[PDB]
Amino acid sequence: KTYVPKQVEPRWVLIDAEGKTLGRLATKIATLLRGKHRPDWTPNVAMGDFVVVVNADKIRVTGKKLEQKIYTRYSGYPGGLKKIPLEKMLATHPERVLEHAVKGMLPKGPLGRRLFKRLKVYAGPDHPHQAQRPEKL
Amino acid sequence: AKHPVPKKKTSKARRDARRSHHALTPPILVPCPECKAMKPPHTVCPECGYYA
Amino acid sequence: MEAKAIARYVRISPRKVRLVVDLIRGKSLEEARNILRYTNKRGAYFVAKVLESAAANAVNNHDMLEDRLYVKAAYVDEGPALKRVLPRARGRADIIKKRTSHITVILGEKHG
Amino acid sequence: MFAIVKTGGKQYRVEPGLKLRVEKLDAEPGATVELPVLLLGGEKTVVGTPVVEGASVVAEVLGHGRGKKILVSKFKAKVQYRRKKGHRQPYTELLIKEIRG
Amino acid sequence: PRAKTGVVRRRKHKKILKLAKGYWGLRSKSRKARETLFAAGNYAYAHRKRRKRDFRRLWIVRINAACRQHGLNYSTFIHGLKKAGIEVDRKNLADLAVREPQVFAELVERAKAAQG
RNA sequence: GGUGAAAAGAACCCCGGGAGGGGAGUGAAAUAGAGCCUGAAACCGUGGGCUUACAAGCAGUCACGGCCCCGCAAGGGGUUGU
RNA sequence: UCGGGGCUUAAGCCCAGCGCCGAAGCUGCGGGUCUGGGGGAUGACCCCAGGCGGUAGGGGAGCGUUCCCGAUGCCGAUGAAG
Ligand SMILES: [Mg+2]
Ligand SMILES: [Mg+2]
Ligand SMILES: [Mg+2]
Ligand SMILES: [Mg+2]
Ligand SMILES: [Mg+2]
Ligand SMILES: [Mg+2]
């Protein structure tokens, strides 16, 4: 029978974001978000590495995107289709742009939402100085 | 019989759930100055009497 | 040790008395007595009467002491039902179901 | 000594003597049988060719026997078609003994 | 001669109702169970074929994530072995990445040289 | 339509207005106690094991894990988290 | 809204190349069954190979309930049927 893993300590990670393409970066963040990188993978338990990102505003994006890219927030009320361009998100809470990126690449299941928690994001940098901080590119 | 009609026989589980708040609540009583009997607050009582 | 006391064929709805019963389940004897006393319900009377008898049976037949017993358990059961007719508009004849109860009350010795 | 060995079309590592269960085989009840098929070992027995050359994993056939009766059953909607059928797989109780490479 | 339906049916039913025991609502208390069983029946058979596929990929992620740690693609890894002529590492027992990683490592080294 | 071999159909005490019970007693048998042999199923209910209040569904099935229970062991049963 | 996140010397389009994924198709190991063929005083059974989705529909082989012969028998209070 295939290996039956057990409790594993959360491996935190420190991730840059300057000049990093939105999609290309989110990809690695998600794959590392779940323990999919470690050969001891197990979709059942879900034990992905705690990813913490900084320098959110620094994220690059190709061609017409700051102006073209649109987001959609729909309330249950009529006409509540409220939509926002990319430039505005960077103005308000910019961390959002990357979150809605990773969130979109995370699985639809409940545990996936549990993974989205493992994902921390800001722009300064300066994370909540906890302990772990294994830098990466 | 007319327009209002139940579409489906409600599941036994769903039925019991409705009667969630249905549960009663025990009355409130207190020892009286007379006998040790338990009178309801702000009240007299038989086999005990009262004053004033 | 435990003492039972059943009241079969009581003209009253189960769901109705179940409420009263659920109040005293696992309660001290004297404590329960007072509950039934001032509880605003019809089912109270039938549960109080039988529960009262459960104490008598516990004493005069099982050497249990009045000052130390409680309601180990209790529950009502649905007996048969008295089906009746009912004249309805346009001649519809709907049967009515005056159900009956089977209140059971079992006392028991406390501790030591 | 993790010794691999393919028999019955399926392969699995092998501990230094331990109770294992493999596909049926034409062997005596409690006799002995040698599996020339062998892959790797304890000290990195790199398998040059598909299967290692001079090497063999032996194990005493502890006995034969059938097992859990898994239940198969076909069905198809809007068409009277349903097939109840039982099936239980036979297997040999290969007790690992020698593991000489 | 008359032949009462007798016990025949009751035995046929409870026989089935036992098999369906554990389910939900009337679905485990009546002929509804029968319907449910047909679904479960065709589910077990379909999920029996799935069970292979499930682990097929289950190991592949283990394998790929493993040799990707040493520095190479899963396709790169396998190609080397298929070339080196080593059917040894059946994808299942490729789990060595957890058990005796050194062994798995040398298997990678073989794949490295076997390619070129 | 059916108590039981036989009425031996429960004297007497206790709670109670009664009904109905708890003792005692008869009987091989009283969940054979009186529309009473056998008593299945729907349906109602109490106690116990496991489970659930960030969750999306023809209700199951496939895998892993936890908890409870049987076994010298491996193993088997119940529950369901993902 | 391209299935969605996303994607710009591409995660788009055209040209060429090597490698891998991926079905219940195929191979591997095991068991069924039917058919044809071989061993065979030996009926028997062993071995080889191939077919085996399936409604109307045809064919074939069984299980089970009621009753009769079997019964002036056998099982049965050390417990039949249910
Ligand atoms: Mg009227
Ligand atoms: Mg009605
Ligand atoms: Mg269908
Ligand atoms: Mg009887
Ligand atoms: Mg289990
Ligand atoms: Mg025929």
XYZ file of C-alpha atoms (C1' of nucleotides) and ligand atoms in Angstrom:
688
model
C 0.000 0.000 0.000
C 1.177 3.508 -0.894
C 2.823 5.564 1.849
C 0.479 6.861 4.537
C 1.972 10.170 5.751
C 1.307 11.782 9.134
C 1.362 15.148 10.900
C 3.960 17.483 9.398
C 5.174 20.840 10.698
C 4.175 23.818 8.498
C 7.103 24.952 6.340
C 6.749 28.723 5.934
C 8.154 30.635 2.964
C 9.059 34.232 2.132
C 8.243 35.264 -1.437
C 9.214 38.406 -3.347
C 6.975 39.975 -5.991
C 8.872 42.834 -7.629
C 8.733 42.744 -11.423
C 7.122 39.310 -11.137
C 4.402 38.642 -13.705
C 1.021 38.239 -12.002
C 0.131 34.844 -13.451
C 3.608 33.312 -13.524
C 4.077 34.097 -9.825
C 0.627 33.003 -8.672
C 1.245 29.658 -10.369
C 4.202 28.756 -8.163
C 2.514 30.224 -5.090
C -0.450 27.884 -5.556
C 1.518 24.752 -6.423
C 3.549 25.455 -3.292
C 0.384 26.516 -1.476
C -0.570 22.850 -1.394
C 2.114 20.270 -0.612
C 2.104 19.435 -4.317
C 5.817 20.262 -4.595
C 6.941 17.875 -1.863
C 7.125 14.217 -3.009
C 5.138 13.310 0.124
C 1.990 14.699 -1.508
C -1.467 13.683 -0.307
C -4.578 15.506 -1.608
C -6.556 14.107 1.319
C -4.799 15.684 4.301
C -3.776 18.894 2.521
C -0.548 20.113 4.117
C 0.710 22.878 1.846
C 3.460 25.302 2.816
C 2.534 28.622 4.422
C 3.298 31.142 1.675
C 3.836 34.791 2.618
C 4.293 37.424 -0.083
C 5.527 41.023 -0.035
C 5.901 43.902 -2.508
C 2.454 43.325 -4.012
C 2.241 46.681 -5.793
C 5.493 45.796 -7.568
C 3.752 43.136 -9.671
C 4.242 43.706 -13.390
C 1.620 43.012 -16.051
C 1.913 42.861 -19.838
C 0.423 45.373 -22.273
C -3.112 46.700 -21.917
C -3.963 45.261 -18.498
C -3.831 48.036 -15.918
C -6.514 49.643 -18.070
C -8.102 46.597 -19.731
C -8.392 44.033 -16.916
C -11.787 44.150 -15.212
C -13.029 42.586 -11.979
C -16.625 41.712 -11.085
C -18.410 42.141 -7.750
C -22.067 41.132 -7.902
C -24.396 41.765 -4.977
C -27.779 40.036 -4.922
C -29.438 43.362 -5.700
C -30.475 44.531 -9.208
C -27.738 46.351 -11.120
C -25.274 45.297 -8.434
C -22.915 44.112 -11.177
C -20.382 46.662 -9.886
C -17.144 46.206 -11.837
C -13.645 47.598 -11.304
C -10.587 48.100 -13.574
C -7.123 46.896 -12.521
C -5.720 50.370 -11.835
C -8.304 50.984 -9.105
C -7.456 47.798 -7.199
C -3.827 48.910 -7.005
C -5.098 52.231 -5.653
C -7.339 50.756 -2.965
C -6.270 47.390 -1.526
C -3.620 46.208 -4.031
C -2.958 42.951 -2.177
C -6.329 41.907 -3.588
C -5.084 41.548 -7.163
C -2.736 38.700 -6.247
C -5.173 37.113 -3.800
C -7.945 36.821 -6.386
C -5.206 35.340 -8.560
C -4.095 32.556 -6.216
C -7.675 32.057 -5.036
C -8.598 31.399 -8.658
C -5.924 28.725 -8.968
C -6.736 27.018 -5.667
C -9.118 24.025 -5.757
C -12.858 24.673 -5.416
C -13.194 22.310 -2.447
C -13.418 23.262 1.268
C -9.786 22.333 1.958
C -8.821 24.728 -0.823
C -10.334 27.539 1.215
C -8.292 26.175 4.104
C -5.249 26.539 1.856
C -6.097 30.136 0.964
C -5.460 30.892 4.634
C -1.911 29.550 4.344
C -1.434 32.366 1.835
C -0.391 35.689 3.375
C 0.106 38.837 1.294
C 1.141 42.471 1.775
C 3.235 45.230 0.218
C 6.021 46.988 2.097
C 7.551 44.514 2.488
C 7.748 43.837 6.241
C 5.718 40.748 7.149
C 4.413 39.977 10.648
C 7.856 39.065 12.001
C 7.078 35.564 13.268
C 9.927 33.113 12.720
C 10.276 31.173 9.467
C 11.257 33.177 6.388
C 12.922 30.900 3.814
C 13.316 33.363 0.942
C 12.639 32.165 -2.603
C 12.324 33.303 -6.221
C -57.557 21.505 -1.017
C -57.268 24.682 -3.096
C -54.253 26.644 -4.348
C -52.145 26.194 -1.201
C -50.767 22.635 -1.290
C -47.669 20.872 0.117
C -45.420 19.864 -2.786
C -43.644 17.040 -0.953
C -44.090 14.867 2.125
C -41.744 16.633 4.536
C -38.859 14.405 5.613
C -39.106 13.059 9.153
C -35.763 14.729 9.840
C -36.872 18.141 8.587
C -40.103 17.818 10.570
C -38.409 17.150 13.908
C -36.111 20.113 13.291
C -39.067 22.498 13.094
C -40.132 21.498 16.597
C -36.697 22.633 17.781
C -37.884 25.653 19.759
C -41.058 23.687 20.450
C -39.612 22.428 23.739
C -41.313 23.696 26.898
C -39.664 25.517 29.794
C -39.988 24.704 33.518
C -41.986 27.191 35.650
C -40.315 29.436 38.222
C -40.958 29.100 41.955
C -39.517 30.337 45.255
C -39.669 29.342 48.951
C -42.306 31.330 50.850
C -42.089 33.035 54.274
C -44.808 30.717 55.598
C -44.316 27.034 54.795
C -41.266 25.768 52.902
C -43.670 25.461 49.959
C -42.601 26.869 46.591
C -44.758 29.838 45.568
C -44.608 31.588 42.182
C -42.983 35.057 42.498
C -45.307 37.963 43.336
C -48.172 35.775 44.555
C -50.092 34.299 47.483
C -50.725 30.554 47.878
C -53.231 27.989 49.210
C -52.314 26.135 52.412
C -50.029 29.056 53.303
C -51.846 32.398 53.273
C -50.215 35.831 53.255
C -49.906 39.196 55.027
C -51.184 42.750 54.525
C -33.283 -0.905 42.053
C -36.102 0.718 40.080
C -39.885 1.090 40.248
C -42.213 1.402 37.256
C -45.718 2.839 36.901
C -47.696 2.858 33.652
C -50.912 4.633 32.676
C -52.316 3.014 29.535
C -55.377 4.113 27.569
C -55.183 7.792 28.574
C -57.390 9.977 26.360
C -54.879 12.584 25.203
C -52.359 13.206 22.423
C -48.814 11.809 22.798
C -47.007 14.846 21.366
C -48.953 16.860 23.936
C -47.833 14.901 27.005
C -44.317 14.364 25.631
C -43.703 18.033 26.365
C -44.621 17.627 30.036
C -42.630 14.408 30.361
C -39.472 15.881 28.857
C -39.531 18.431 31.684
C -39.132 16.003 34.584
C -36.939 13.339 32.984
C -33.974 12.806 35.301
C -35.294 15.123 38.018
C -35.445 14.737 41.795
C -38.818 13.507 43.041
C -39.734 16.578 45.087
C -38.334 18.814 42.350
C -40.552 17.218 39.711
C -43.609 17.296 41.979
C -43.438 21.085 42.114
C -42.957 21.365 38.352
C -46.174 19.478 37.598
C -47.859 21.505 40.328
C -47.643 24.931 38.697
C -47.000 23.860 35.099
C -49.650 25.217 32.731
C -50.637 22.129 30.725
C -53.276 19.403 30.553
C -50.666 16.673 30.158
C -49.373 17.722 33.570
C -52.253 16.099 35.437
C -51.848 12.683 33.815
C -48.070 12.656 34.267
C -48.300 13.875 37.865
C -50.852 11.225 38.822
C -48.830 8.336 37.388
C -45.508 9.737 38.632
C -47.070 10.011 42.067
C -48.019 6.343 41.863
C -44.486 5.493 40.754
C -43.357 6.640 44.199
C -45.957 4.551 46.020
C -44.909 1.473 44.059
C -41.278 2.340 44.789
C -42.004 2.389 48.515
C -44.751 -0.108 49.360
C -43.229 -2.745 47.072
C -39.521 -2.095 46.523
C -38.148 -0.856 49.871
C -37.091 2.401 48.202
C -37.059 5.604 50.264
C -39.203 8.598 49.317
C -36.461 11.064 50.260
C -33.825 9.572 47.949
C -35.426 8.577 44.639
C -35.628 10.345 41.271
C -36.699 9.797 37.666
C -34.200 7.293 36.260
C -36.213 7.583 33.054
C -39.697 8.190 31.663
C -41.523 8.346 28.343
C -44.965 8.261 26.743
C -46.063 5.753 24.104
C -48.689 6.076 21.378
C -51.603 3.725 21.985
C -54.446 3.027 19.515
C -56.578 5.851 18.090
C -60.317 6.553 18.264
C -61.258 7.354 14.669
C -64.326 9.573 14.258
C -66.242 11.010 11.301
C -66.622 14.732 10.584
C -69.258 16.497 8.446
C -67.431 18.754 6.009
C -68.621 21.252 3.405
C -70.139 19.791 0.230
C -70.478 16.440 1.980
C -66.805 15.577 2.387
C -66.335 13.114 5.249
C -62.974 13.510 6.977
C -61.952 11.091 9.713
C -60.670 12.623 12.950
C -58.130 10.836 15.152
C -58.561 11.247 18.906
C -55.341 9.489 19.901
C -54.416 7.948 23.250
C -51.301 7.823 25.431
C -49.230 5.302 27.385
C -47.322 7.351 29.956
C -44.503 5.419 31.610
C -42.573 6.659 34.638
C -39.716 4.776 36.286
C -38.113 6.030 39.488
C -34.833 4.879 41.002
C -32.490 5.032 43.972
C -30.071 7.958 43.842
C -26.569 7.269 45.169
C -24.661 6.516 48.366
C 16.559 -5.258 2.441
C 13.990 -3.776 0.055
C 13.964 -6.390 -2.694
C 11.472 -5.901 -5.522
C 9.964 -8.852 -7.405
C 7.382 -9.153 -10.184
C 4.995 -12.104 -9.978
C 1.375 -12.357 -11.054
C 1.915 -9.303 -13.234
C 2.179 -7.130 -10.132
C 5.353 -6.282 -8.218
C 6.115 -5.195 -4.655
C 9.091 -4.769 -2.334
C 10.032 -7.524 0.105
C 11.137 -7.336 3.735
C 13.599 -9.846 5.243
C 11.038 -12.593 5.814
C 7.454 -11.430 6.317
C 3.859 -12.445 5.581
C 2.808 -11.483 2.049
C -0.076 -12.303 -0.286
C 0.357 -12.728 -4.042
C -1.595 -14.005 -7.050
C -2.287 -17.744 -7.205
C 0.523 -20.066 -8.292
C 0.869 -23.727 -9.283
C 2.791 -24.755 -6.156
C 2.398 -27.405 -3.455
C 0.469 -26.458 -0.293
C 3.358 -25.781 2.094
C 6.326 -26.195 -0.249
C 9.005 -23.783 -1.468
C 9.300 -21.698 -4.637
C 11.974 -19.378 -6.018
C 11.290 -16.083 -7.776
C 14.219 -15.387 -10.137
C 12.607 -12.025 -10.863
C 14.305 -9.449 -8.645
C 14.835 -5.689 -8.635
C 17.153 -3.706 -6.354
C 17.871 -4.643 -2.743
C 19.162 -3.205 0.520
C 22.542 -1.839 -0.558
C 21.506 -0.342 -3.904
C 21.296 -3.410 -6.142
C 20.993 -1.337 -9.319
C 19.088 -3.382 -11.892
C 21.174 -3.007 -15.050
C 18.956 -4.960 -17.423
C 15.185 -4.858 -16.835
C 15.618 -7.478 -14.104
C 18.763 -8.145 -12.072
C 20.974 -10.947 -13.391
C 22.313 -13.349 -10.770
C 19.855 -12.997 -7.890
C 16.706 -14.586 -6.468
C 14.033 -14.089 -3.814
C 12.737 -17.306 -2.254
C 9.576 -17.777 -0.194
C 7.645 -20.700 1.278
C 4.131 -21.112 -0.104
C 2.258 -20.970 3.202
C -0.945 -22.006 1.439
C -3.638 -21.202 -1.112
C -7.106 -19.780 -0.538
C -9.988 -17.635 -1.754
C -10.912 -14.336 -0.107
C -13.479 -11.553 0.210
C -16.357 -12.008 -2.226
C -16.640 -8.683 -4.049
C -20.069 -8.142 -5.591
C -20.439 -6.967 -9.181
C -23.780 -5.731 -10.490
C -24.713 -4.043 -13.759
C -27.810 -1.890 -14.259
C -29.350 0.252 -16.994
C -32.191 2.774 -16.786
C -35.420 2.759 -18.829
C -34.427 -0.748 -19.918
C -35.021 -4.037 -18.115
C -31.362 -4.953 -17.649
C -29.709 -5.935 -14.379
C -26.987 -8.491 -13.696
C -26.248 -9.745 -10.197
C -22.965 -11.637 -10.076
C -20.457 -12.643 -7.408
C -16.701 -13.046 -7.711
C -13.901 -13.803 -5.253
C -10.194 -13.756 -6.100
C -7.916 -16.718 -5.264
C -4.482 -16.017 -3.766
C -1.329 -17.693 -2.449
C 0.081 -17.013 1.018
C 3.716 -16.446 0.052
C 5.789 -16.351 3.240
C 9.103 -14.647 2.481
C 12.184 -16.620 3.516
C 15.474 -16.087 1.689
C 16.498 -12.812 0.041
C 19.962 -13.535 -1.364
C 21.001 -11.292 -4.245
C -53.893 -26.272 -5.670
C -53.442 -22.698 -4.442
C -50.032 -21.221 -3.650
C -50.121 -18.287 -1.242
C -47.476 -15.652 -1.906
C -46.386 -16.872 1.506
C -43.046 -15.850 2.962
C -41.316 -15.625 -0.423
C -41.637 -11.846 -0.810
C -40.860 -10.788 2.768
C -37.603 -12.737 2.564
C -36.738 -11.204 -0.807
C -37.325 -7.708 0.551
C -35.650 -7.826 3.964
C -32.828 -9.608 2.149
C -32.339 -6.467 0.068
C -33.192 -3.989 2.823
C -30.304 -5.393 4.866
C -27.883 -4.774 1.999
C -29.097 -1.180 1.863
C -28.775 -0.708 5.620
C -26.804 2.395 6.574
C -28.261 4.784 3.999
C -30.589 7.756 4.499
C -34.293 8.253 5.205
C -36.768 5.970 3.438
C -33.848 5.262 1.107
C -32.804 2.597 3.624
C -36.256 1.555 4.839
C -38.130 0.537 1.684
C -38.052 -0.425 -1.995
C -36.435 2.997 -2.398
C -33.332 1.189 -1.187
C -33.523 -1.046 -4.254
C -33.256 1.957 -6.559
C -30.400 3.276 -4.451
C -28.585 -0.043 -4.685
C -28.673 -0.084 -8.483
C -26.881 3.265 -8.393
C -24.419 2.069 -5.752
C -23.908 -1.119 -7.737
C -23.002 0.716 -10.924
C -21.019 3.115 -8.743
C -18.852 0.404 -7.208
C -18.058 -1.045 -10.630
C -17.246 2.335 -12.170
C -15.252 3.399 -9.114
C -13.450 0.066 -9.305
C -11.979 1.061 -12.655
C -11.401 4.531 -11.224
C -9.474 3.148 -8.255
C -6.620 2.156 -10.556
C -6.595 5.548 -12.269
C -6.667 7.277 -8.887
C -3.407 5.677 -7.770
C -1.863 5.803 -11.243
C -1.741 9.580 -10.925
C -1.331 9.451 -7.147
C 2.146 7.994 -7.568
C 2.968 10.163 -10.584
C 2.640 13.314 -8.489
C 4.892 11.698 -5.888
C 7.372 10.709 -8.596
C 7.342 14.029 -10.435
C 7.542 16.059 -7.229
C 10.454 13.852 -6.170
C 12.781 14.004 -9.179
C 11.784 17.638 -9.635
C 13.548 18.092 -6.296
C 16.726 16.568 -7.732
C 16.201 18.632 -10.875
C 14.344 17.044 -13.792
C 10.905 16.513 -15.337
C 8.785 13.407 -14.816
C 8.862 12.912 -18.582
C 12.631 13.342 -18.408
C 12.909 10.827 -15.567
C 10.794 8.117 -17.189
C 12.367 8.577 -20.622
C 15.746 7.764 -19.109
C 14.488 4.581 -17.471
C 12.585 3.473 -20.566
C 15.906 3.984 -22.353
C 18.202 2.460 -19.725
C 15.930 -0.572 -19.960
C 14.876 -0.707 -16.320
C 11.252 -1.783 -15.918
C 12.289 -2.116 -12.270
C 10.738 1.115 -11.014
C 7.075 0.382 -11.527
C 5.499 3.778 -10.883
C 3.946 2.351 -7.716
C 7.264 1.354 -6.139
C 8.705 4.672 -7.304
C 7.476 5.693 -3.849
C 11.098 5.134 -2.838
C 11.278 8.928 -2.728
C 9.941 8.541 0.810
C 11.385 5.123 1.638
C 15.166 5.031 1.189
C 15.614 8.317 -0.730
C 19.255 7.443 -1.419
C 18.040 4.522 -3.520
C 15.704 6.829 -5.427
C 18.595 9.251 -5.842
C 20.865 6.669 -7.454
C 17.943 5.755 -9.698
C 17.940 9.383 -10.802
C 21.707 9.292 -11.331
C 21.242 6.260 -13.563
C 18.595 8.165 -15.517
C 20.937 11.149 -15.802
C 23.705 9.129 -17.458
C 21.388 6.798 -19.382
C 20.085 9.750 -21.390
C 23.487 11.147 -22.341
C -62.600 -16.521 13.822
C -57.897 -18.482 17.695
C -56.251 -17.313 26.075
C -54.808 -22.297 28.159
C -53.963 -29.019 28.990
C -57.689 -26.850 32.615
C -60.397 -20.598 34.343
C -57.219 -22.617 37.803
C -59.899 -15.451 34.652
C -55.366 -12.787 39.383
C -58.436 -13.398 46.514
C -55.748 -9.612 49.616
C -52.307 -4.906 50.159
C -50.547 -0.415 47.828
C -51.263 4.685 44.088
C -55.979 6.249 41.981
C -62.356 9.294 41.286
C -62.278 5.794 37.694
C -59.226 3.723 34.053
C -54.650 1.719 34.484
C -50.653 0.100 37.155
C -47.027 -1.965 41.072
C -46.846 -6.459 44.563
C -48.784 -11.189 45.726
C -51.026 -15.554 43.727
C -52.375 -19.462 39.582
C -49.758 -21.610 35.354
C -44.765 -25.404 32.349
C -45.253 -20.529 30.127
C -48.537 -13.765 32.110
C -43.639 -9.339 26.466
C -50.037 -16.602 27.145
C -53.785 -11.432 31.414
C -58.529 -11.299 28.420
C -60.793 -9.161 20.721
C -55.229 -12.336 25.111
C -51.205 -18.127 19.883
C -47.360 -16.889 16.294
C -46.432 -10.798 16.244
C -43.108 -9.424 10.300
C -43.289 -3.887 7.785
C -44.472 0.973 7.469
C -45.036 4.560 11.732
C -44.129 6.719 17.061
C -40.652 6.790 21.366
C -36.492 6.392 25.438
C -31.259 5.067 26.501
C -26.370 4.216 24.440
C -21.663 4.476 20.401
C -19.970 7.657 16.403
C -21.222 12.382 13.835
C -22.481 17.726 12.478
C -23.439 24.960 13.219
C -17.779 28.124 6.261
C -21.683 24.833 4.154
C -23.772 23.321 -2.596
C -27.248 18.217 -2.926
C -30.499 11.468 -6.879
C -27.586 11.536 -0.888
C -24.370 7.083 -2.962
C -19.656 4.867 -4.266
C -13.798 4.751 -4.165
C -9.321 6.052 -0.866
C -6.898 7.845 3.566
C -7.269 9.213 8.573
C -9.685 9.841 13.677
C -13.159 7.967 17.359
C -16.216 3.380 19.549
C -16.663 -1.823 19.626
C -15.212 -7.569 18.949
C -9.866 -10.646 18.354
C -3.561 -13.975 20.905
C -2.232 -11.357 15.985
C -2.988 -9.841 11.229
C -7.961 -8.777 10.593
C -13.368 -7.785 10.695
C -17.948 -4.342 12.183
C -20.364 0.583 13.185
C -19.755 5.974 12.439
C -17.895 10.023 8.912
C -13.791 14.076 8.596
C -11.417 15.234 3.730
C -16.293 35.443 -18.628
C -11.923 32.189 -23.235
C -14.889 26.202 -18.851
C -12.552 29.838 -14.813
C -7.721 32.136 -12.684
C -5.013 34.000 -15.712
C -1.488 34.484 -20.445
C 2.098 38.968 -24.612
C 10.394 37.266 -27.351
C 3.250 33.632 -24.748
C -0.141 29.762 -21.487
C -1.808 33.110 -28.752
C -1.005 31.635 -34.363
C 2.032 29.096 -38.330
C 6.717 25.330 -39.228
C 9.990 21.218 -37.601
C 11.822 17.899 -33.437
C 12.416 14.770 -29.249
C 9.995 13.102 -24.347
C 5.770 12.198 -21.301
C 0.235 12.148 -19.678
C -4.076 9.889 -20.851
C -9.813 4.619 -21.993
C -13.080 -0.275 -19.409
C -8.796 -0.062 -26.643
C -3.744 -3.400 -25.942
C -0.106 -6.306 -23.031
C 0.936 -8.711 -18.224
C -0.860 -12.396 -13.884
C -5.543 -14.975 -12.050
C -10.446 -16.884 -12.331
C -15.783 -17.882 -15.385
C -18.120 -19.631 -19.125
C -19.388 -21.369 -24.154
C -17.268 -23.174 -28.766
C -13.680 -25.881 -31.843
C -9.344 -29.140 -31.238
C -5.830 -32.874 -28.636
C -4.786 -36.930 -24.526
C -8.295 -40.881 -23.320
C -10.227 -50.051 -21.770
C -10.115 -45.366 -19.071
C -16.787 -42.776 -18.441
C -13.701 -39.005 -16.355
C -10.944 -34.899 -16.334
C -6.242 -32.331 -17.740
C -4.013 -29.003 -21.710
C -4.100 -25.470 -26.025
C -6.856 -21.373 -28.696
C -10.767 -18.207 -29.594
C -15.911 -15.793 -28.636
C -18.561 -13.610 -24.461
C -22.296 -4.822 -24.308
C -27.006 -5.424 -25.673
C -34.128 -3.458 -26.020
C -37.840 -5.818 -28.834
C -37.100 -11.415 -30.104
C -35.713 -16.562 -30.443
C -33.014 -20.352 -27.802
C -30.887 -22.926 -23.197
C -30.102 -24.195 -18.051
C -31.579 -23.507 -12.913
C -33.611 -21.558 -7.920
C -38.093 -20.969 -5.146
C -43.786 -21.275 -3.214
C -48.742 -24.842 -3.159
C -50.212 -29.903 -3.419
C -49.604 -35.774 -4.627
C -46.790 -40.552 -4.844
C -42.239 -41.683 -1.813
C -45.455 -42.491 3.856
C -48.528 -47.969 8.316
C -41.522 -44.509 6.518
C -38.080 -40.528 8.535
C -37.106 -35.691 11.326
C -39.727 -33.557 15.909
C -40.696 -31.391 23.188
C -33.094 -32.900 23.993
C -38.367 -27.954 20.218
C -41.639 -28.603 13.856
C -43.430 -24.329 10.843
C -43.096 -19.235 10.989
Mg -67.775 23.216 8.017
Mg -54.396 12.254 8.104
Mg -28.696 6.783 -16.101
Mg -46.908 -17.215 24.844
Mg -13.830 1.335 8.637
Mg -36.477 -23.355 -21.679
